[PDB]
Design a protein around this ligand. Structure first.
Ligand SMILES: [Cl-]
Ligand SMILES: [Cl-]
Ligand SMILES: [Cl-]
Ligand SMILES: [Cl-]
Lengths: 479, 480
């Protein structure tokens, strides 16, 4: 494959200045006979008070559903002993996985994650790599520290993850909002914004492009292509923060009958149905992907990875060395053991069960919106991916709109309070509104929304909450 | 009833002060409130977490076979953490909770044990102290710089110190002004004089690895800690005690091998009395932050430590943690909680006493070998009372090529390093650890070298082989 473009000009001055420890240049002499190596700081693994760790995990192909009790034939016991000799093959024995080591990641874990990445995403340049993270939260903080200096500008979705904005605000990085419709970023308006751009270009575009938080939108293949062309034309990176990528679902249909027939029935059909990632389009190497186990296995793993071109990933590693250092050896050893026990085939089985479970929740959620929410003042886009749904309301139709000084946010607050009074809580959309100006600034409404999740609660309680939300909209809008 | 700490919020960076809670925190109160269907969150379903159980085999108090004895037979205890609270022994963090998103402060069972531990050892002398989790001292140091420093601010560091700690400061544009040391650590009299003359904005804090100092192997005496605390109070800066080696304190070195066993701590009371007072034990004002870690006590791969300090300063670390590291591994915290609660405070003290015995013996063999093999004509050594590092100091001015080297001690250091490599032994040159920096604006404005070794990394037979090789290297270069 071709080499990626040289994008080291997009690194921050601070990232570029980062150095390896001066004790790197005695590492060669480590574990090399003839030399008694006394120049290091490693504690003795002999004292690590963990002889083995075990977990009980479910068994592919998860035929009883991924939520089935982990018992009987749906229970296998994985074991990571301290010594390599005591392990089945391809494990990270605790004497090494609980020892300081390469900030890039443990070799068995990285090998598995690299194969997964290439199998799904077919990275179309030669010099790509994967490094470990302790989750997309830390990966995001590190991304800002690698590509942004104080006063720099990034592009964000005009509604996005509040935590992502808070990280940007703490590093003094301007978050200029990119206009969305119910299907996400509008490529025409991003092209227009960049065609007129005054002063230093934004360093990158930050996108939760699958199951977007909070809109529940997913960028179509067609919008991803157009946004990619903009990033190549104006020379900025795309950061795809993709913890919800494997919460893609069957397309929603009003027709209940035509649902059981829709499910994917094998691995090659599953992999073909997945929306192309930005990394799959990234012939230039200007995409950095933040991947996580948090929504796939468990948030408490504190384990993810970063996909991108070797020379940009090398700067993240320098930062990792003097910040988070490395993920938990327990997390990385146990994830390695689970993924190798399942193998790629069982991990694919797991992702297919995840797809089936979320497809059903979304079906129940959207059936309930269609049923209970009054259509005269509302709309909804059924999500194709993610844990989130939204309800859009025409605030201008609230009977107190004039008394509220034509302020849509007073209508949002009144519907919020009414929802709580009816015994249901959604997240007001305005809470996710991104604000920012470039330095210097670029030359220079009535619809509100609420974010819900169908991932959290039992589906009987999801229907109870949404009927109550329907009542709250009816009471407030006088229908 | 202890005093309140001083209000030190004026020492926070403007950036830290401006950090906010998630707009979503003010709907958490409705979470799991009866009558509310809570659809406002983003927690995935614990029903799918593919871990029914995690277990570990750990050694058994009082570790009478030594902390490194095989974990088998009576020296094997199986701890289990089930997914469901009902399946666990008491005080466990069931995987349904430990593997779910949670308070960035920490899991309450782990915090409770580590707070008890902290008070039992350090007796924090103000009321409004707390502890929060970290993913180790590396991250807690990165966080400390982001909490108390803006670009162009100044911190005080030990003249020779941890290269990773300086790399972290350099990355944040924080100036590292070196504080003069002798073989016993920071010289308080010189630090007081530096501060008495100080022009421009005061340093935000002093960064010290005060016990088993990297790389000097020094430990500040109780007396130096007192004098240094007084300077921090008088000039109003914080003390960041980065203390991963606190529990590698050892018996005082004596040449008399016969005297060693009788002098050793055996009991919990003797142990708690032999430990050097922490800065937090002195910290009547609440101007100390302690970075604590299990990396040198349990295993580096836990990626679990904690931060000790006054409530209002730790809350700012928590805001930063929420949008950086988030939380330590729930496997790490759940297994650490299980191990610590199974051993209890009594078993944990037993472990720390075994650790003290193990390190004391490694240090005895290392220093006995230095005494035996390193030529005394051009060398000296300070036996450490704590840590994993020893040093050998050399008078570069006595090297026969000193004139040929233009009286550059660093050329004598390079020559000894190369000769050591050629004799088959490798130590870390002292100059590699030297800190440099100037305040903004700058303050108005040596023949000895040293090497750092560790006695913790290799079997003790190989350590003696290595230090005899280093003696040969010093004898060859100095012509002795
Ligand atoms: Cl796979
Ligand atoms: Cl809005
Ligand atoms: Cl000392
Ligand atoms: Cl020096």
């Amino acid at each position: 494959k071709p080499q990626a473009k040289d994008l080291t000009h997009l690194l921050s001055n601070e990232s570029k200045a980062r150095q390896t420890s001066p004790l790197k240049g005695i590492f060669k002499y480590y574990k090399q006979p003839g030399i008694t190596f006394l120049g290091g700081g490693l504690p003795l693994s002999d004292y690590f008070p963990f002889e083995k760790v075990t977990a009980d995990i479910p068994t592919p192909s998860f035929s009883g559903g991924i939520g089935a009790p982990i018992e009987g034939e749906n229970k296998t016991t994985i074991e990571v002993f301290k010594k390599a000799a005591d392990n089945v093959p391809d494990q990270i024995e605790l004497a090494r996985s609980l020892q300081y080591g390469s900030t890039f990641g443990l070799p068995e874990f990285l090998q598995f994650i690299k194969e997964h990445t290439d199998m799904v995403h077919k990275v179309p340049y030669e010099n790509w790599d994967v490094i470990v993270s302790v989750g997309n939260t830390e990966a995001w903080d590190s991304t800002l520290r690698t590509f942004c200096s104080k006063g720099d500008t990034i592009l964000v979705e005009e509604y996005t993850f509040s935590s992502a904005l808070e990280s940007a605000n703490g590093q003094g990085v301007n978050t200029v909002p990119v206009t969305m419709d119910e299907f996400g970023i509008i490529p025409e308006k991003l092209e227009e914004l960049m065609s007129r751009w005054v002063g230093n270009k934004p360093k990158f575009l930050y996108t939760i492009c699958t199951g977007q938080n909070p809109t529940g939108s997913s960028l179509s293949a067609e919008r991803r292509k157009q946004i990619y062309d903009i990033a190549c034309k104006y020379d900025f990176l795309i950061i795809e923060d993709e913890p919800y990528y494997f919460l893609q679902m069957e397309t929603y249909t009003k027709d209940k009958a035509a649902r059981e027939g829709k499910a994917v029935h094998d691995h090659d059909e599953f992999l073909k149905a997945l929306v192309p990632s930005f990394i799959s389009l990234d012939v230039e190497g200007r995409v950095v992907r933040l991947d996580s186990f948090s929504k796939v296995l468990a948030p408490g793993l504190r384990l993810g990875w970063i996909v991108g071109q070797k020379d940009l990933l090398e700067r993240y590693v320098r930062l990792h060395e003097v910040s988070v250092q490395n993920p938990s050896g327990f997390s990385e050893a146990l994830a390695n053991a689970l993924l190798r026990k399942w193998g790629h085939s069982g991990y694919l089985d797991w992702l297919i069960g995840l797809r089936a479970e979320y497809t059903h929740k979304r079906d129940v959620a959207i059936d309930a919106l269609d049923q209970f929410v009054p259509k005269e003042v509302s709309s909804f886009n059924p999500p194709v991916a993610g844990m989130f749904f939204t309800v859009t309301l025409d605030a201008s139709k609230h009977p107190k709109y004039k008394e509220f000084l034509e302020d849509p946010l007073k209508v949002e607050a009144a519907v919020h309070e009414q929802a709580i009074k009816q015994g249901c809580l959604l997240a007001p959309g305005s809470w996710f509104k991104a604000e920012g100006q470039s330095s210097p600034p670029q030359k220079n409404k009535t619809h509100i929304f609420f974010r819900g999740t169908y991932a959290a609660v039992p589906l009987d309680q999801l229907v109870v909450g949404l009927e109550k939300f329907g009542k709250a909209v009816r009471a407030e809008f006088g229908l």
